[PDB]
Amino acid sequence: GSVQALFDFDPQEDGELGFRRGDFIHVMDNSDPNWWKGACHGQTGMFPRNYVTPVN
C-alpha cells in the first residue's frame, strides 16, 4: 500500500525518491530493511524506510 512521510526526505542522487513530510508514497518493494522502492510526485525511486509510517 502507501505509506506517509514522517519527515522531509532530501534526495542526494538520481534514483532517490524525494518527498515532504505528510506526502503519500506508494510502495513498490518493501523487501530491504532500510531502503524501499516507491512512487510519488510522478517519480519512482529509492527512499529510507525509517522516514515513513503506515497510514493512520
The owner of cell 530493511 is 33
Q: Return the SS3 of 54.
A: strand
Instruction: Annotate 2-51 with DSSP letters as a single string.
Output: EEEESS-B---STTB--B-TT-EEEEEE--SSSEEEEEETTEEEEEEGGG
Domains along the sequence of the chain with CATH: 1-56 (2.30.30.40)
**What grid cell was written down for 39?**
512512487
For residue 9, the one-letter residue type is: F
